[PDB]
Amino acid sequence: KAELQSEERKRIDELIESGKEEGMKIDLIDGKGRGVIATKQFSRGDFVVEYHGDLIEITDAKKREALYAQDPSTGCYMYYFQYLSKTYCVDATRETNRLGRLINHSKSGNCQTKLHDIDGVPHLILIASRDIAAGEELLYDYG
Amino acid sequence: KAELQSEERKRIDELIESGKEEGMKIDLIDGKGRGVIATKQFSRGDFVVEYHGDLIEITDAKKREALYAQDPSTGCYMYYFQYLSKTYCVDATRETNRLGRLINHSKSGNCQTKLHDIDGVPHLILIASRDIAAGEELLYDYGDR
Ligand SMILES: *CCC(=O)NCCCNc1nc(N2CCCC2)nc2cc(OC)c(OC)cc12
Ligand SMILES: *CCC(=O)NCCCNc1nc(N2CCCC2)nc2cc(OC)c(OC)cc12
Incomplete structure (x- = not known):
């Protein structure tokens, strides 16, 4: 173990809250x-x-959703999930410098989603679903 | 006022339960x-x-959403809402003969959304936000409103 799990949780919390993203880069596939x-x-x-x-x-x-008035044919960045009796939305519509919303989808990716609680507040994270080689495209699937 | 409200509630219920979608058609706008x-x-x-x-x-x-495994750049037909403190989704992904899912979006639209109850079951309907003349393209806004 619980100590190691609590300590890894702490490192994930610190990465999440730091504003930093490493081990990846934008590229043209x-x-x-x-x-x-x-x-x-x-x-x-x-x-x-x-x-x-x-x-x-x-x-x-x-x-x-009502105010963006964007066309639905271009895709949606609003992801819905339930967490401890409440329904939430992670709304990634804003064009920030963050990489999570840039990871492409695949019928079989190498990233899966998990809910990560930080003091009762859920965070939607991507974790590796299998071993990933450097240079591979990060691809998510829902799963 | 209650009589006109009830008569209309029954009119909307019958249309939903008949499948018939009158006064509109698919077209190259x-x-x-x-x-x-x-x-x-x-x-x-x-x-x-x-x-x-x-x-x-x-x-x-x-x-x-996990099974369709679609590319998110082509848009989503799954609409999420809360009705009587419960979360629902209306999933119109399937290509049917239904016209509602084909209505284009516009903030300057002539259709608005409304949750219409049929014995505790919510139905998402499109209602005219203003007068619509024949030949006008139908366009929805997400607003109530
Ligand atoms: C990020 C916001 C977003 O894209 N939301 C999608 C909501 C579900 N998709 C969708 N919904 C509707 N509605 C919901 C309320 C009445 C009309 N119409 C849609 C129409 C189209 O194309 C004409 C799409 O295309 C993907 C999606 C719709
Ligand atoms: C109809 C199903 C659907 O389109 N759902 C939209 C879910 C929110 N959109 C979205 N979500 C994600 N996630 C969710 C879990 C981690 C990754 N990534 C997205 C990535 C992209 O493009 C790269 C889009 O493009 C619109 C949307 C994403």
Whole structure:
């Protein structure tokens, strides 16, 4: 073990809250376009990056969705989930410098999502679903 | 006022439970592209069409989102809402004969959303936000409002 689990949790909390993202970079994938590449090896289970965005409840998510007035054909950055009796939305619509929202989707990726609680506040993170080689495209799937 | 409210509530319920979607058609909208055009007049407040899809709970919404495994850049047909303190999703991903999911979005729209109850079951419907003349493209706004 619990000590090591608590200590790894602390390192994940510190990375999440620091504002820093390492071990990855934006690159153009041949025949695909923009994507995120691992610039270091990842082991199955390792923290990759947060899917960073504003955490809001469903009422505020509806207010935001109504006001963006963006066309739905271009995709949505608002992700919904339930956590301890509440429904939340991680709204990553804002065009920030964060890499989590840039990781492409795949029918079989090397990143999976997990909810990571920080003092009763859930964070949507990407963890490695298998071992990842440096240079591989980071690809998520829901799962 | 209660009589007119009840008569209309029954009119909306019958249309939903019959599958028939009258006064509109699929068309190449002038100067834009594919959409839905009104083929009759609609007064402000009138029922236009339901945003038809599978009504599911959040657990099943997560499983479907995981199974479709679609590229998120092409848009999403899964609409999340709260009704009587419970979370729902109307999933219109399936390509059916239904027109509601084909109505284009616009903040300058002529259709607004409303949650319409049928024996405790919420249905997401589109209602005319203003008068709509025949030949106008139907366009939705997410607002109530
Ligand atoms: C990030 C916000 C977002 O994209 N939300 C998507 C909500 C579900 N998708 C969707 N919803 C509707 N509605 C909901 C309320 C009545 C009309 N119409 C849609 C229409 C289209 O295309 C015409 C799409 O395309 C993906 C999605 C719709
Ligand atoms: C109809 C299903 C759907 O489109 N769901 C949208 C979910 C929110 N959008 C979104 N989410 C993520 N996540 C969620 C869990 C970690 C990764 N990544 C996204 C990435 C991209 O592009 C790279 C988009 O593009 C619109 C949306 C994402």
